[PDB]
């Protein structure tokens, strides 16, 4: 599921304050940003330019400038006509996936699926009601804009994603070793203890962390969410609730692709 | 209405060692709408000069942000993350955990 997509966030708090954000993402990683002051596509990595030339990037810059300004102004203008209730959010995600092409583009109003772009036309989600159909009628007014959108989704993104992946192959396939430590958690209950194994600093995302007693995996291990840091690395906590007298010989084991078969083993000390 | 309360998770980039510089992260995910006030608190008072990531959203359109600051832990220093949102009657504070 190697997908590249552009996200658009438009927040309309009151009639005076409207904020616009455009960014580009290779899955979980952010690689591009939009600058309204300079109206430029800021590249967050040297390989974020991917495979295209400067002329193609300038053309994309002009297209994005026109599209963003016109879409912001139009959403402002059609707010009462489309029954958009202040305050409201408009969220858009659009891009391509994969080996293969697999394009997509969709828009949500107030956090729920509202409309999407399917072949050369905007189709409303049936559950969104008549407002989505009216929005699609407005969105399908200009055939030229729909043709540009179809070209962007079916041609520009598939050609861009291959070059972006090739130029970022070194960064994407890099291996960063994790580090781990142990700590106490909140008391689960009387006569019971919570043991916490933190793993931080690893890349890529997949990782294996388990509380063990010898070779026996402790199935009471509770693995939390994988959390990011400002660098590219990830963080994760694994907890185990045990009786106060049954905490001896317990340990935490971490397997990551960077460790090259040498699992990190930390041993619990309760003194 | 259809509003999603933020999930707040506090952690450190490295294990806490007194006198050693480290990073404190507050991750605020799965909230809607996006207008939010996330602050990092050192001993109650707000920490100035806090960096945060660009706004984004997950598959289900809920928003997430990462706030982080550089800090040197002390023996008697306590840290927390304080979040305000339309879904919160009072600000929610999640404390850092170090044993």
């Amino acid at each position: 599921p190697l997908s590249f997509h552009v996200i658009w966030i438009a927040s309309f708090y009151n009639h005076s304050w409207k904020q616009n954000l455009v960014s580009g993402w290779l899955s979980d990683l952010q690689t591009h940003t939009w600058d309204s002051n300079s109206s430029t596509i800021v590249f967050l990595w040297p390989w974020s330019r991917g495979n295209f030339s400067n002329e193609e990037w300038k053309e994309l810059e002009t297209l994005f400038r026109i599209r963003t300004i016109r879409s912001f102004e139009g959403i402002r203008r059609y707010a009462h006509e489309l029954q958009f209730e202040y305050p409201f959010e408009i969220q858009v995600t659009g891009g391509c996936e994969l080996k293969v092409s697999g394009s997509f583009l969709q828009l949500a109003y107030q956090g729920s699926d509202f409309v999407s772009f399917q072949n050369n036309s905007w189709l409303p989600y049936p559950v969104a009601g008549n407002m989505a159909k009216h929005f699609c009628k407005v969105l399908n007014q200009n055939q030229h804009e729909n043709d540009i959108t179809h070209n962007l989704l079916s041609d520009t993104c598939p050609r861009f994603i291959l070059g972006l992946l090739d130029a970022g192959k070194a960064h994407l396939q890099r291996q960063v070793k994790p580090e781990a430590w142990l700590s106490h958690g909140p008391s689960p209950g009387p006569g019971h203890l919570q043991l916490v194994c933190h793993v931080s600093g690893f890349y890529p995302k997949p990782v294996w962390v388990m509380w063990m007693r010898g070779e026996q995996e402790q199935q009471g291990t509770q693995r939390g969410d994988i959390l990011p840091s400002a660098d590219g690395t990830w963080y994760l906590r694994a907890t185990l609730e045990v009786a106060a007298g049954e905490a001896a010989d317990l340990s935490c084991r971490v397997k990551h692709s960077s460790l090259e078969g040498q699992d990190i083993v930390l041993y619990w000390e309760g003194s | 209405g259809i509003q999603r309360t933020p999930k707040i998770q506090v952690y450190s980039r490295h294990p806490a060692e007194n006198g050693k510089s480290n990073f404190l992260n507050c991750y605020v995910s799965g909230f809607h709408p996006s207008d939010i006030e996330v602050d990092l608190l050192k001993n109650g008072e707000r920490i100035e000069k806090v960096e945060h990531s660009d706004l984004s959203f997950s598959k289900d359109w809920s928003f997430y942000l990462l706030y982080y600051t550089e800090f040197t832990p002390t023996e008697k220093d306590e840290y927390a993350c304080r979040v305000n949102h339309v879904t919160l009657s009072q600000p929610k504070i999640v404390k850092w955990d170090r044993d």
Partner: T-cell receptor
């Protein structure tokens, strides 16, 4: 949006005395401003004081405010009642983070007893 | 200061804000016994008038340099349009919202 209500149509108090005008608001903003304004007989609006949700009771000048923040009340007490202070006093609220239009109340006139 | 008009005509008022901030100007309507309310919001940087909820599409318009000579025009005015109109703007600090000179409009059949 939000609601603002001040019920007193008019009040009276002697010179060199004090009086308080009540203002009950109903909002869903966790950060907001409460503004007090005075309307002269010549139809002119004068800024009096601003009140912060995360701020202590503002007591600037001859005016003081009371924050029943749990009860959502911003009361305006005036001091050293003069003749010029006779006007129609209004309370409104606005968004602290995104300043925009003001939700005013019905208003309340004051008549200084001679 | 005072304007008298007849039903079905139009009236152009000007507002006197000392210098404003040459930014975003709100127009407020005040009536006796009622609460003053914002009628429209004018953004000079784009010359875009956004009307309040439930306001007729062409009832009000705004134009002119926002410094001192800022005009708001009401069309197809009815008896309910009588009242005192103000223009207001947030100062640079967004600390207080300065209100300009109000003009009283009287509409008679």
């Amino acid at each position: 949006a939000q609601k603002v209500t001040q019920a007193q149509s008019s009040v009276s108090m002697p010179v060199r005395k004090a009086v308080t005008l009540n203002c009950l608001y109903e909002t869903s903003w966790w950060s907001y401003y409460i503004f007090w304004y005075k309307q002269l007989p010549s139809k002119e609006m004068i800024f009096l004081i601003r009140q912060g949700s995360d701020e202590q009771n503002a007591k600037s000048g001859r005016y003081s405010v009371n924050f029943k923040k749990a009860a959502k009340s911003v009361a305006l007490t005036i001091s050293a009642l003069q003749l010029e202070d006779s006007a129609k006093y209004f309370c409104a609220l606005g968004e602290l983070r995104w300043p925009d239009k003001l939700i005013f109340g019905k208003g309340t006139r004051v008549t200084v007893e001679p | 200061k005072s304007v008298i008009r007849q039903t079905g005509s139009s009236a152009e008022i000007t507002c006197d804000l000392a210098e404003g901030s040459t930014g975003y100007i709100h127009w407020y309507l005040h009536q006796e016994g009622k609460a003053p309310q914002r009628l429209l919001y004018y953004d000079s940087y784009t010359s875009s008038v956004v009307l309040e909820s439930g306001i007729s599409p062409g009832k009000y318009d705004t134009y002119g340099s926002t410094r001192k000579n800022l005009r708001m025009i009401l069309r197809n005015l009815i008896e309910n349009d009588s009242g005192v109109y103000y223009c207001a703007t947030w100062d640079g600090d967004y600390y207080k919202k300065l209100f300009g000179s109000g003009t009283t409009l009287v509409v008679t059949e």
